[PDB]
Design a protein around this nucleic acid. Structure first.
Ligand SMILES: Nc1ncnc2c1ncn2[C@@H]1O[C@H](COP(=O)(O)OP(=O)(O)O)[C@@H](O)[C@H]1O
Ligand SMILES: Nc1ncnc2c1ncn2[C@@H]1O[C@H](COP(=O)(O)OP(=O)(O)O)[C@@H](O)[C@H]1O
Ligand SMILES: [K+]
Ligand SMILES: [K+]
Ligand SMILES: [K+]
Ligand SMILES: [K+]
Ligand SMILES: [K+]
Ligand SMILES: [K+]
Ligand SMILES: [K+]
Ligand SMILES: [Mg+2]
Ligand SMILES: [Mg+2]
Ligand SMILES: [Zn+2]
Ligand SMILES: [Zn+2]
Lengths: 531, 531
DNA sequence: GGATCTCGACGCTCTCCC
DNA sequence: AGAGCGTCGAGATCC
């Protein structure tokens, strides 16, 4: 909500030191957007909140000032693997930093305690969990004693959106960080986040007891990324063959990421690509630091070409020259797909974001997110993105980023913008009636229909007992019928029915709520068909 | 082959009449190469043999002299279809000509007989079968009467290669044709042919008793023709879709020819092209004269865009502005492909020769040509042409016309010459060992394998009984495997085994004779692939 | 008559998250 | 336990 352009100077007393720590210590060349302004706000002793996408370079905005200020910097991070992620790079660069989780032994805990009060303990960044602030009586004590000794000067809050309710990813410990700025007022506070709306940001400002605060948000639009949606072949081996052909065609030798829904799927793709001559490796977030360094250094040294990652996992893979991100299966939500695909083309040059749309993936993910009360809705948003053939994909993604998406032209940088066929709207009402006929007949016979059984009964296949008498199967291929059934699902003419078995959660199809709209013979249902 | 440059007039006693008949009677502008010289040797009262490709314009070389001399010219034609074709061309032009076969009615025979001795008879060309000469005494008597009356002066023997028992199909009746030059020595004889085969050319000089005569042959190389080979999709509808796409992309509005292997194939192809918006028309040599005129007037007036014909013996389509000849299936032989594709670009301008190579076409045609003792070898030459991706197609075709093909540079007039692909010899011996393992096991389980069954067992598909225990299916697509199997068949590492059923001939695959060449470890089977 | 493609019925496999 | 997949037998179509 603030204008960072006024802070994009280098004439501050600290700008020389900042530039060198960036070039000779951090081994970087020039600042990414909003980094210099955020750093300049922090070095001036003011609080600042930075909203910036994952993989953008948010961490530097507090790591570099910690090396330009005196003493140490406290970093509130909620999860331990994420900490170790930062710590690896931190003292791989030669920056003495440390960690405090619940499970650290007494040796290290007392060493850290003595180092906070030490005068040239070379330590510059202490990462701690919010429980260490909320539920540790005297961690606060020597925090205050280091403050009085001018050693405690900066606070960095990761995932600041976790402070506010009417928000998601709420960690309750985040209430108690309001003590920090209350007890440490001269210490400058910086909060960083990638998923935050201003309505939540202001609540977090109130919660942290930071009223006057700058708010910089980055342009989430990445014009160098090309968004594309491709059909997912039902055969897994044909799918891997198509992936290998695409990689060898467009991205021969270029580094890339392949996102899979499951860990089994990612291991699966790693070995399959390896057998077909594409050097690949797997990466896991709940990983040992060392094998993280292993997969990372094999990727950087181009020893392997493609990194196979899991959806809610990646969280630390960071390569500037990622030329393509292939989604082996669609993501749980549109925001998740944005943050996942966006890790590509961090060098601001052209990169491709390919997504493979599979009919069965819809119901796998739907069956997986049943416990999330909004999982199905966000998944249907993703499915509607995959089904859309006319709108520019950048606009579709922008629909979920109203506050952080600059209204910029796509410049023919997505498959729909380049697709030079205009479309026409087919009346699909007959197909909906036929599907409802099938579903009601299966309901009468006490039979539950999986999407596959519904499709087969529609095509005159599957169990003869489940077929409606005299229903002529449509003249369209399986894929088109799948898109039609998906469309009916989104418009809620059909609805999902989850059944919980001892082994897994199965998703059947049932007549939807809006189906009664068909009682109107004048009711028309329209779809947009390729030419 | 004689030197025709000395016969390149314009100063002969008949050159005025020749030019007048060419421009005012035949409505032509300029002589095609070797037309002038041949007509001149004929008008000087000498015998001549003309070798010119199908569609070159050979008929004029005997039609024009008959219109400059007095009386009529006898034309020996083996088949009735070519007779009706020439009768069309002559009757439209207002040139009175007639034909007399065994199946001609009584009064028509009487009419021709009375017309021969008639002095004021407007008849200029009498087409007859060699049986009319061999097995008709009354016809020979009328020929004698006309010869002595100075009305019969010229003899034209079409498809003269039929005299020889070495050329393409030999007619026994043609053996008797040697009586003509024996009974009418002052009558000038011209023999026409498209298959040069100079052994055959010395023959039927022997048979016709014309051994001392001029023999002109044309340059078979057509530099304006671009030779290309494309892949035939296994699905027939994708096949027709590709044909429509090619025509609408490259050849909007241009006249074209589509050669099909089977009659029903050509019919189907017309109907499917019409359904897709390409005005098409079918043509068969054994057609009524009226509908042949129908199809030709629809083609000339651009009322139909493409003409689909089956590869029979007797395709007189003969249109000057044929911009593309697409072979829906490969041809039985290389010479056949040349003669068929050569109908393109008769105006000496650029024209395309598209060839659709299908794996199953090999075995249709091999099953069809089992009685021709050399049919399989020539079909394999065709297959070797289709498989070749490096050598210039012009050189490959010219290898079969060594005496009549001038060694001229292609100048990027074929698909392989224009592509700038570097090539690499891949070792494929392991694939041959695997295939031989499969076929040998199928012999062990005492079963015969069709090409489809062998390729399926190679890919781990089809009947489990026919699968090799430990054979891993190759990582290449099915079509690449079709390419490998075709290469092994051509090189005789595999062989065909025909089985005769009550309604068709099946083609199975068995271990080939050269397979034993693998006893040596140093034996390598290389295949040239893109790099 | 045999290959080739469908249908259908029976046995078998597997059970998708971070 | 249920859904889905692979495999084989029986029927239909074609030459
Ligand atoms: N100014 C910059 N120039 C070049 N690379 C940068 C810059 N800032 C950050 N990076 C790189 O981006 C990668 C990911 O940044 P990170 O700090 O993880 O951002 P976030 O915390 O938003 O995920 C890091 O490996 C870092 O080396
Ligand atoms: N000199 C020429 N100029 C223009 N067209 C010609 C010439 N000679 C022949 N043609 C045309 O070529 C077509 C086919 O020739 P044709 O006599 O059938 O040769 P062939 O007997 O070798 O098939 C004829 O329709 C004719 O009109
Ligand atoms: K300022
Ligand atoms: K692209
Ligand atoms: K061309
Ligand atoms: K040549
Ligand atoms: K095949
Ligand atoms: K066959
Ligand atoms: K079926
Ligand atoms: Mg981040
Ligand atoms: Mg001819
Ligand atoms: Zn766009
Ligand atoms: Zn060439």
């Amino acid at each position: 909500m603030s204008s960072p352009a006024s802070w994009n100077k280098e004439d501050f007393p600290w700008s020389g030191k900042v530039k060198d720590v960036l070039q000779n210590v951090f081994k970087l060349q020039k600042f990414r957007p909003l980094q210099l302004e955020t750093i300049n706000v922090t070095m001036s002793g003011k609080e600042v909140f930075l909203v910036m996408p994952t993989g953008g370079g948010k961490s530097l905005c507090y790591q570099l000032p910690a090396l330009c200020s005196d003493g140490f910097t406290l970093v509130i991070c909620p999860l331990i693997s994420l900490m170790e992620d930062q710590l690896m790079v931190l003292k791989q660069l030669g920056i003495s930093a440390t960690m405090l989780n619940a499970s650290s032994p007494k040796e290290h805990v007392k060493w850290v305690h003595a180092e906070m009060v030490n005068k040239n303990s070379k330590l510059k960044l202490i990462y701690v969990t919010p429980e260490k602030i909320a539920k540790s009586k005297m961690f606060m004590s020597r925090l205050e004693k280091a403050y009085e000794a001018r050693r405690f000067t900066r606070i960095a809050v990761d995932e600041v959106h976790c402070c506010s309710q009417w928000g998601h990813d709420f960690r309750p410990d985040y209430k108690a960080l309001g003590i920090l700025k209350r007890q440490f007022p001269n210490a400058s506070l910086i909060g960083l986040t990638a998923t935050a709306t201003s309505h939540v940001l202001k609540d977090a400002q109130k919660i942290l007891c930071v009223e006057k605060c700058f708010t910089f948000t980055a342009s989430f639009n990445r014009p160098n990324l090309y968004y594309e949606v491709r059909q997912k072949p039902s055969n897994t081996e044909d799918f891997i063959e198509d992936i290998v052909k695409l990689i060898n065609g467009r991205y021969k030798g270029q580094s890339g990421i392949i996102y899979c829904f499951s860990q089994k799927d990612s291991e699966q793709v790693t070995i399959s690509l390896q057998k077909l001559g594409i050097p690949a490796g797997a990466y896991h977030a709940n990983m040992e630091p060392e094998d993280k360094t292993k997969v990372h250094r094999r990727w950087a040294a181009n020893e392997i070409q493609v990194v196979v990652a899991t959806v809610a996992f990646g969280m630390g893979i960071d390569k500037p020259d990622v030329r393509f991100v292939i989604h082996h299966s669609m993501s749980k939500s549109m925001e998740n797909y944005y943050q996942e695909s966006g890790r590509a083309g961090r060098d601001d040059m052209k990169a491709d974001c390919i997504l493979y749309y599979g009919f069965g993936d819809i119901f796998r993910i739907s069956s997986m997110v049943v416990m999330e009360n909004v999982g199905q809705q966000k998944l249907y948003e993703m499915v509607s993105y995959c089904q859309n053939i006319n709108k520019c994909r950048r606009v579709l993604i922008a629909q979920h980023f109203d506050e952080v998406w600059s209204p910029e032209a796509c410049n023919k940088m997505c498959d729909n913008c380049c697709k030079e066929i205009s479309f026409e709207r087919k009346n699909v009402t007959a197909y909906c009636r036929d599907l409802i006929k099938i579903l009601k007949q299966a309901e009468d016979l006490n039979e539950k229909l999986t999407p596959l059984k519904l499709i087969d009964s529609w095509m005159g296949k599957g169990a003869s007992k489940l077929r409606v008498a005299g229903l002529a199967p449509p003249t369209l291929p399986r894929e088109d019928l799948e898109k039609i059934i998906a469309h009916f699902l989104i418009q809620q003419y059909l609805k999902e029915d989850y059944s919980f078995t001892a082994y897994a959660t199965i998703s059947y199809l049932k007549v939807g709520p809006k189906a009664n709209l068909l009682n109107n013979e004048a009711h028309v249902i329209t779809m947009r068909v390729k030419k």
